[PDB]
Amino acid sequence: SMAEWYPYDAAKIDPPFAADGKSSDVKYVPLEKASKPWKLCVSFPHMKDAYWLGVDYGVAEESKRLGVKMNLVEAGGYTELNKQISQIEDCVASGTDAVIIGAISADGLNKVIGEIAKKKIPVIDLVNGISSPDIAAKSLVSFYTMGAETGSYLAKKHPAGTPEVVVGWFPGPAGAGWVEAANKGFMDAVKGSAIKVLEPKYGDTGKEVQAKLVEDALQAAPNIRYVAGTAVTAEAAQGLIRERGLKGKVDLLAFYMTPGVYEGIKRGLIMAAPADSMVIQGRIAVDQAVRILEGKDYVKHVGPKIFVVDSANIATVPQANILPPDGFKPVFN
Numbered sequence: 001s002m003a004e005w006y007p008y009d010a011a012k013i014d015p016p017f018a019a020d021g022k023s024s025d026v027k028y029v030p031l032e033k034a035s036k037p038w039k040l041c042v043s044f045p046h047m048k049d050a051y052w053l054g055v056d057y058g059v060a061e062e063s064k065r066l067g068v069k070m071n072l073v074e075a076g077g078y079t080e081l082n083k084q085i086s087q088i089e090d091c092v093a094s095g096t097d098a099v100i101i102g103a104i105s106a107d108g109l110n111k112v113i114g115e116i117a118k119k120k121i122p123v124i125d126l127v128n129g130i131s132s133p134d135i136a137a138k139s140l141v142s143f144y145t146m147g148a149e150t151g152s153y154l155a156k157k158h159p160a161g162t163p164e165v166v167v168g169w170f171p172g173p174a175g176a177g178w179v180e181a182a183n184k185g186f187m188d189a190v191k192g193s194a195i196k197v198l199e200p201k202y203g204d205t206g207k208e209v210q211a212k213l214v215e216d217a218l219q220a221a222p223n224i225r226y227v228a229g230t231a232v233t234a235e236a237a238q239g240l241i242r243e244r245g246l247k248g249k250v251d252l253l254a255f256y257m258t259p260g261v262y263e264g265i266k267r268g269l270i271m272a273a274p275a276d277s278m279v280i281q282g283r284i285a286v287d288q289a290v291r292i293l294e295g296k297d298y299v300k301h302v303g304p305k306i307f308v309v310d311s312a313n314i315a316t317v318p319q320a321n322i323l324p325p326d327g328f329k330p331v332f333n
């Protein structure tokens with residue numbers, strides 16, 4: 001039979017949950033099987049995009065592999081904190097062994113998580129990050145690291161002492177936590193190289209908004225060498241580059257992964273983007289839950305090791321570790 005997803009390159013944080021904990025590289029090894037058909041309640045913010053479809057795929061496939069029963073519910077959007085609270089309350093009242101949560105906000109579920117913990121039910125923090133002290137384990141990554149890996153990739157191509165090259169940087173909506181973290185990471189990582197970054201151009205992750213920013217930047221700086229920023233930005237920039245006759249003169253990068261960015265890399269139109277292996281974040285959360293329920297050793301705070309995908313390695317990575325399969329329909333049971 002064909003290779004399993006594991007062992008998988010990961011990075012764990014010690015002390016776990018510490019805001020200043022140290023990262024170390026480790027291979028993540030899950031259990032071969034669960035000892036019983038544990039019931040896992042899985043609460044998602046929504047099922048509206050490819051990203052959370054990818055997390056769904058990981059949770060469903062890892063639950064199947066281990067032999068456990070997943071019951072997944074989704075709240076319909078990031079406006080829906082109250083529905084996520086009720087859906088979690090309800091899955092616990094109905095009876096469950098552990099709860100895996102992709103939280104709509106960092107603090108908003110803290111009250112209900114505290115109440116669940118009083119019932120000796122493990123709660124796993126999946127992807128987004130929860131500030132509750134009653135979390136048993138985290139399966140997630142940092143957007144600082146996503147930005148940093150994107151920046152280091154470019155900085156290696158353009159080391160100190162080589163000719164200055166200009167990057168147009170389009171980080172997403174100003175002041176958003178994830179954006180400001182990716183920004184700091186990107187800027188820290190390119191420091192001391194021949195990269196010059198233009199002042200950041202923020203805006204909402206709308207296609208037209210980001211296209212207009214890139215247009216305006218190209219007008220102002222005709223010699224821009226790279227356009228880097230959100231996946232929305234990189235996807236929208238492909239057409240602009242084509243229309244302006246800049247293909248191969250300006251390269252595109254995103255600081256996170258989407259199907260559109262993936263196809264772009266495949267087709268030679270987008271140069272690179274990091275992958276957080278969100279499918280594997282889903283799988284690890286399930287493995288963590290099972291290990292806790294069975295009293296086994298587990299890694300308390302861990303994420304997949306972030307790596308940059310480009311033409312030279314995209315064919316070497318199974319898509320299903322970093323995106324949902326094409327055509328995949330969401331699974332709830």
Ligand SMILES: [Cl-]
Nearest residue numbers: 046077078079
């Ligand atoms: Cl949403």
